[PDB]
PDB file of C-alpha atoms in Angstrom:
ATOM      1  CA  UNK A   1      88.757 117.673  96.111  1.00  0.00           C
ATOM      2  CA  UNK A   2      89.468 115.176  93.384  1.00  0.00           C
ATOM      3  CA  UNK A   3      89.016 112.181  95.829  1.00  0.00           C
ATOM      4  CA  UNK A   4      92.754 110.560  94.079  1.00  0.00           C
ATOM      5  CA  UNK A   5      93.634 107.378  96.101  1.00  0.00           C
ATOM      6  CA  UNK A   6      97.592 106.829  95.676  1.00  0.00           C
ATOM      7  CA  UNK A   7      97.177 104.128  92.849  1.00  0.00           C
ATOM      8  CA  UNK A   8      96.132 107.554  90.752  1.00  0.00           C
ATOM      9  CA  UNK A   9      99.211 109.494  91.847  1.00  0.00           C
ATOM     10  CA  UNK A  10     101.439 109.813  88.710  1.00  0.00           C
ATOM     11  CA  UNK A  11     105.104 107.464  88.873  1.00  0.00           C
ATOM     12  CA  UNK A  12     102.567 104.315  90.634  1.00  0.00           C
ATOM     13  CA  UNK A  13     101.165 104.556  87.081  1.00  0.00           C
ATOM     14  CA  UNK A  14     104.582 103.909  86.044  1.00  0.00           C
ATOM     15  CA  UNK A  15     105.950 101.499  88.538  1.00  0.00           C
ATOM     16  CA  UNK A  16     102.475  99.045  88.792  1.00  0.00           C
ATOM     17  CA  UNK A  17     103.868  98.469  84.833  1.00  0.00           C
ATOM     18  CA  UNK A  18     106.631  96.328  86.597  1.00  0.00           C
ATOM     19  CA  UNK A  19     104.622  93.688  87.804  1.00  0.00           C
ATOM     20  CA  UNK A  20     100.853  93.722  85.692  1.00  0.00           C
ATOM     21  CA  UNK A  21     100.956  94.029  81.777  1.00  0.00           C
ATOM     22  CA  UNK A  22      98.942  96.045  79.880  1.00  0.00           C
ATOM     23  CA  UNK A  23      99.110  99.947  78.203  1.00  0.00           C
ATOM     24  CA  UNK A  24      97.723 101.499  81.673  1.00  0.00           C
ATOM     25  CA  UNK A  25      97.322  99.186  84.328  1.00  0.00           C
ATOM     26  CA  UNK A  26      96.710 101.711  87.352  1.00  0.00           C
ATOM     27  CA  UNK A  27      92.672 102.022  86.154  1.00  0.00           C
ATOM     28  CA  UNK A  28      92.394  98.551  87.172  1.00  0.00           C
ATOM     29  CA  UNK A  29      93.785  98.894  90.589  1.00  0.00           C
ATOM     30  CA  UNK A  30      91.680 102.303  91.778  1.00  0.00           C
ATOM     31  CA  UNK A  31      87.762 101.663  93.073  1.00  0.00           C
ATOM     32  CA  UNK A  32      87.820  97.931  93.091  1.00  0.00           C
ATOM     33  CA  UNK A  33      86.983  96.602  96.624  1.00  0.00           C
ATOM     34  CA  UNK A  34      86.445  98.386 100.086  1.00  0.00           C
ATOM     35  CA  UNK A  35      90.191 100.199 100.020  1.00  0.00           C
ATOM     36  CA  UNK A  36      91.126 100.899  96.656  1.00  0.00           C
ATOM     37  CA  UNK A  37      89.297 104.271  96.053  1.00  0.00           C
ATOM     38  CA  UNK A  38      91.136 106.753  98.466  1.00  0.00           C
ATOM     39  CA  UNK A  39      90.948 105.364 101.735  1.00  0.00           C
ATOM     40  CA  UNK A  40      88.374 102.753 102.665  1.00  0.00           C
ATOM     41  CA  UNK A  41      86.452 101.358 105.607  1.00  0.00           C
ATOM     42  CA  UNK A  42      84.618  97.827 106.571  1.00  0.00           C
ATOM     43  CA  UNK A  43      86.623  94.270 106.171  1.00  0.00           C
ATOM     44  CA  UNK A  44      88.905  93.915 102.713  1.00  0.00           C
ATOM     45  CA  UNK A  45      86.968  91.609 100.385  1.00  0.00           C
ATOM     46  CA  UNK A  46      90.602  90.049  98.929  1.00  0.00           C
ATOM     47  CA  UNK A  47      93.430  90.143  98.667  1.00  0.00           C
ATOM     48  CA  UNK A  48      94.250  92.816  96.258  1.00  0.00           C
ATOM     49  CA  UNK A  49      91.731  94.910  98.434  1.00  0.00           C
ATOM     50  CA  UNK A  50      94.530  93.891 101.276  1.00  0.00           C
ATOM     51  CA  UNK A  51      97.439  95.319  99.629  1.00  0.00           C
ATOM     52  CA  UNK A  52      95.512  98.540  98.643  1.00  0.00           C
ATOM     53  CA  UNK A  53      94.916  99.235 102.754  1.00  0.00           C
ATOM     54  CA  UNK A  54      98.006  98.847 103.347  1.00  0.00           C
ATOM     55  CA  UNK A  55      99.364 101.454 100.300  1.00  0.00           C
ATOM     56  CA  UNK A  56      96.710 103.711 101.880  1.00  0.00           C
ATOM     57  CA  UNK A  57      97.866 103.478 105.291  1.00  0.00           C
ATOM     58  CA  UNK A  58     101.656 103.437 104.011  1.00  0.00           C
ATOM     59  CA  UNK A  59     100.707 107.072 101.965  1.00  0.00           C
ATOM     60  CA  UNK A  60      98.890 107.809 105.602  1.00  0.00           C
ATOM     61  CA  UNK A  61     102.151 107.755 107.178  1.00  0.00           C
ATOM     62  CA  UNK A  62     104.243 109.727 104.337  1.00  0.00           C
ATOM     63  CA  UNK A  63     101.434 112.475 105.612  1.00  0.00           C
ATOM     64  CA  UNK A  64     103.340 113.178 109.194  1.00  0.00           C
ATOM     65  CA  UNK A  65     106.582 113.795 107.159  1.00  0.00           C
ATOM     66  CA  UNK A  66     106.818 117.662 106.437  1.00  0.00           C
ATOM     67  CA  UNK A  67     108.604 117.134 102.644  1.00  0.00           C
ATOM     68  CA  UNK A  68     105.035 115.485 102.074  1.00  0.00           C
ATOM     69  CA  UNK A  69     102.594 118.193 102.173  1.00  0.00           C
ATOM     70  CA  UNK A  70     100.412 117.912  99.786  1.00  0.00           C
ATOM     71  CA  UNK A  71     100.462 114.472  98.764  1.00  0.00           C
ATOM     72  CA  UNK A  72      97.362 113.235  97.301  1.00  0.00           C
ATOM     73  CA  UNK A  73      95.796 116.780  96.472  1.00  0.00           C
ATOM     74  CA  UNK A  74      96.399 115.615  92.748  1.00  0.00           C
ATOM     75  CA  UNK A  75      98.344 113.268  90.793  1.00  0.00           C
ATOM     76  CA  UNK A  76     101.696 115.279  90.287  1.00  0.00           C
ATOM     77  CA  UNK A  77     102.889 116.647  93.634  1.00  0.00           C
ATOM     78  CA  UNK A  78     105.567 114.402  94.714  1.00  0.00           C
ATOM     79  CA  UNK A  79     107.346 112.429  91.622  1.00  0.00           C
ATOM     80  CA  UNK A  80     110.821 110.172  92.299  1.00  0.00           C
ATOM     81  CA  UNK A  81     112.976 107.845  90.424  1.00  0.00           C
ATOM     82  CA  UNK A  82     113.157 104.224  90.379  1.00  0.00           C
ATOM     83  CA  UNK A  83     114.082 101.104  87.881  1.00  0.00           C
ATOM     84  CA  UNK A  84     112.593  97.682  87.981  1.00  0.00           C
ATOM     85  CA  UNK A  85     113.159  94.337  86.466  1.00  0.00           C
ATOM     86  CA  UNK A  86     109.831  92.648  87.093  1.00  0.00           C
ATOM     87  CA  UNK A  87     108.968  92.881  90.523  1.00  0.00           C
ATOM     88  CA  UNK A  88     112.673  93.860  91.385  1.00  0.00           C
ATOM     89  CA  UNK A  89     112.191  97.325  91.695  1.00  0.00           C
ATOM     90  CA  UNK A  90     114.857  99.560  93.391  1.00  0.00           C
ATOM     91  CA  UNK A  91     113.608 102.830  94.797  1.00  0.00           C
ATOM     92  CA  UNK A  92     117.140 105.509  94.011  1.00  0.00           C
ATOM     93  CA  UNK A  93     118.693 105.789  96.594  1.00  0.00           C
ATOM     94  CA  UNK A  94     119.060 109.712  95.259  1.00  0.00           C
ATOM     95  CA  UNK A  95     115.273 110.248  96.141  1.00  0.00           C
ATOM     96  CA  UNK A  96     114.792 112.801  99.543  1.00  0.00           C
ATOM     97  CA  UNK A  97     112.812 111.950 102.218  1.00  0.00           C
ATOM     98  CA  UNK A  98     109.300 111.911 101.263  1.00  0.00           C
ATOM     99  CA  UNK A  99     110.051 110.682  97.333  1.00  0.00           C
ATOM    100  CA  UNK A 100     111.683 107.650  98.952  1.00  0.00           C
ATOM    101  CA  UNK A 101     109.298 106.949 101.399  1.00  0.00           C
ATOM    102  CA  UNK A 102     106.440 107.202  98.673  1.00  0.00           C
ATOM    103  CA  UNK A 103     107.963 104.737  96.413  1.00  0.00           C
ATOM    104  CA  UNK A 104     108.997 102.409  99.119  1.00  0.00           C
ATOM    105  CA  UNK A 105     104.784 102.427  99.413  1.00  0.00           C
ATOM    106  CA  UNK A 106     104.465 102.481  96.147  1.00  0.00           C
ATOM    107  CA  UNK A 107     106.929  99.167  95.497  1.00  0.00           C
ATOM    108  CA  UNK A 108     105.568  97.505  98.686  1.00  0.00           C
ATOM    109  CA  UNK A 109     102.019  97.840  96.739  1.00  0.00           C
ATOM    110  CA  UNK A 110     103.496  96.859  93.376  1.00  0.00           C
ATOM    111  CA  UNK A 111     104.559  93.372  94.818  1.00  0.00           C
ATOM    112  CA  UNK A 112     101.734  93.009  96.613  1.00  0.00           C
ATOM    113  CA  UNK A 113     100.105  93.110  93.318  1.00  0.00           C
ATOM    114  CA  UNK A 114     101.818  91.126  91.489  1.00  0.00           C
ATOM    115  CA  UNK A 115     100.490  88.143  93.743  1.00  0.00           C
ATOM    116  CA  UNK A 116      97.338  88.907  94.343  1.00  0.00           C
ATOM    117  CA  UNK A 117      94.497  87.327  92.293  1.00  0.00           C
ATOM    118  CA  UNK A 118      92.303  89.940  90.280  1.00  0.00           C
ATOM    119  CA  UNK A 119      88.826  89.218  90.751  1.00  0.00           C
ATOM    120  CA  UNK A 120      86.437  91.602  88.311  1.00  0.00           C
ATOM    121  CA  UNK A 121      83.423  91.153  90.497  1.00  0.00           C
ATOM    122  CA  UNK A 122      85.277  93.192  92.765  1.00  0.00           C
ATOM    123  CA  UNK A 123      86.069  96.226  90.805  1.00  0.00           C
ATOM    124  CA  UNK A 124      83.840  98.782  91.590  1.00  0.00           C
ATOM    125  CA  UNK A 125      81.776  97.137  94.487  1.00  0.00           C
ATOM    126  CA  UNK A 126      78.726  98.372  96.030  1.00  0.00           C
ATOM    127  CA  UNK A 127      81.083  99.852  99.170  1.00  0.00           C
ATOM    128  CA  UNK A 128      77.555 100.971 100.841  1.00  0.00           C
ATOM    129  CA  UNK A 129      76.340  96.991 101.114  1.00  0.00           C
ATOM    130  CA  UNK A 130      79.977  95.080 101.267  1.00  0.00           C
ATOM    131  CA  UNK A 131      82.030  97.698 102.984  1.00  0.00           C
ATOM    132  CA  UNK A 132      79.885  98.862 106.183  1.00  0.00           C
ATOM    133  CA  UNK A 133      82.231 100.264 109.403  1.00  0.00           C
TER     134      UNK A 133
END
């Protein structure tokens, strides 16, 4: 398997552009820490690393609805619709059941973002010495 974490999967690409600038954003926020690769284990070093364990365990919990299979097998499974001004970001309220619960994760993460620090030492970390279970 690819090994995607949710800050991979295709409209967080879009959405994280709400809250951090830049032309693609979501390669900042994927490997950085103990829980921004797909899932995670030991202590989260900040708190960015924070709000990614969280967006993993929120994408953890789309997994027990049944319009959700499949989600995280690759980028382009699930999509949904949303607008944002800034870290206002409305999830439609046309989305079904696991679109909406996705991009309430994925705006929950997005805000989460938007106030948490970004520390390059971070990005990338040796998980096997900082990240130990």
């Amino acid at each position: 398997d690819s090994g995607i974490s949710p800050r991979a999967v295709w409209q967080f690409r879009k959405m994280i552009k709400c809250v951090i600038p830049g032309s693609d954003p979501f390669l900042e926020y994927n490997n950085y820490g103990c829980y921004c690769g797909l899932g995670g284990s030991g202590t989260p070093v900040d708190e960015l690393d924070k709000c990614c364990q969280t967006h993993d365990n929120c994408y953890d919990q789309a997994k027990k609805l049944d319009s959700c299979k499949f989600l995280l097998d690759n980028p382009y499974t699930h999509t949904y619709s949303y607008s944002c001004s800034g870290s206002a970001i409305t999830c439609s309220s046309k989305n079904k059941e696991c679109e909406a619960f996705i991009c309430n994760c994925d705006r929950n993460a997005a805000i989460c973002f938007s106030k948490a620090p970004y520390n390059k030492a971070h990005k990338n970390l040796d998980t096997k010495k900082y990240c130990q279970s």
